[PDB]
């Protein structure tokens, strides 16, 4: 009776940890690039680590002071929008 | 009590499906990469042997001690999440 | 007159949808390229920063004066049409 | 009354120019390559600007006198058939 | 006899569809490659002009005499099967 | 009458040879790589001829004695599992 209740407890714990592993292993990556130049309209030219250069948007949460040539950036993999400025 | 036995069966069915999903996410073929640096929030910058650099998530079962710059890693091919540190 | 008011509403709905379609076609992320040469029929040969060269179409809103060999261009990622000349 | 009629006029004009921009920005590009060699059966080996070499068909409208080694060509992006010989 | 005439029509319809399927499989665009070596079981290692090396199947209509290391080949783009030896 | 019967015969022959050509031209290729290193758990790190390195499984029919660094391997194109060790 309490044996069952403990099993429910450990199973709930196990299942939570597994759900967490799934969430971690399915999260999309961000792509790394380097800022090349900033355009008069607030779009940024990034050189992606994949090779090409793109004109991309920037997250609204980004301190645009940090965006300057040579700055390392992390990009949404689909839109290539700048999500993080990296150290 | 019958409620409990039923809950245990439900939870084990759920556990079983989560285990299979995790196995698939962690199964070969895995892409090889090299850790570039570790971010404050615990995401990792890896250089993939495909060429580009990514900010990625990690399995919760990695030994954090071995997760350091220059470490060789096995990455989920789709998300590039770090599944294992390699020797 | 009611016929007219109805036509105006129809046309504005259509205008609205066309504007959105054009905004999507012109939105970041745009690939960067360089104009290689301009063909007699007004198509352009660009070298994409992805590597290959293409004969592409252009937006009708480009200043033809700046569209010349060596100019840097923002290309629709799918068709490589020239959306903007860049500085 | 004539105000409405003028609006219909300008809207029809605006909508036409938008439709044109859509058509221009959705037209597929042609891929540039260089003729490598011509085969005894009228197929051509082209070196694409994407890297590889292919055996391709040629448009029926092409003056085959113009097809010779070193000649720059424009290819249908899907079939890689030679569509234009470029200057 | 009517059974026979019917069988002939059936078989010719089937022949027609197989011929079209084979024509499609052998039609341009074909990737160019170079034979690297011939395996005991008669599969061939080719180096594709795309870069990688493959173990591939071959058309039964290839002259085996010309199928040898260094020979230039036309490959199905999807399977990289050898469709023709090229001069 | 025997004319028909002979036609059925030759058509059946023709159709068989066409079916064979389809089967040969549709068979997937194997990708060539080189063994890089063998892991303590029986997974192998392969350097694919496409460029990247992967951790892959190995066919159960493979003599694991033959798997050693430098060994040339043929891989299932989708799973990248080692299917053959090549001379």
Swiss-Prot record, chains A, B, C, D, E, F:
Entry superkingdom: Archaea
Location in the cell: Cytoplasm
General function of this protein: ATPase which is responsible for recognizing, binding, unfolding and translocation of substrate proteins into the archaeal 20S proteasome core particle. Is essential for opening the gate of the 20S proteasome via an interaction with its C-terminus, thereby allowing substrate entry and access to the site of proteolysis. Thus, the C-termini of the proteasomal ATPase function like a 'key in a lock' to induce gate opening and therefore regulate proteolysis.
Domain commentary: Consists of three main regions, an N-terminal coiled-coil domain that may assist in substrate recognition, an interdomain involved in PAN hexamerization, and a C-terminal ATPase domain of the AAA type.
Entry's family note: Belongs to the AAA ATPase family.
Quaternary context: Homohexamer. The hexameric complex has a two-ring architecture resembling a top hat that caps the 20S proteasome core at one or both ends. Upon ATP-binding, the C-terminus of PAN interacts with the alpha-rings of the proteasome core by binding to the intersubunit pockets.
Name listed for the protein in its UniProt record: Proteasome-activating nucleotidase
Species the sequence originates in: Archaeoglobus fulgidus (strain ATCC 49558 / DSM 4304 / JCM 9628 / NBRC 100126 / VC-16)
Span of the entire protein shown here: 57 to 120 of 398
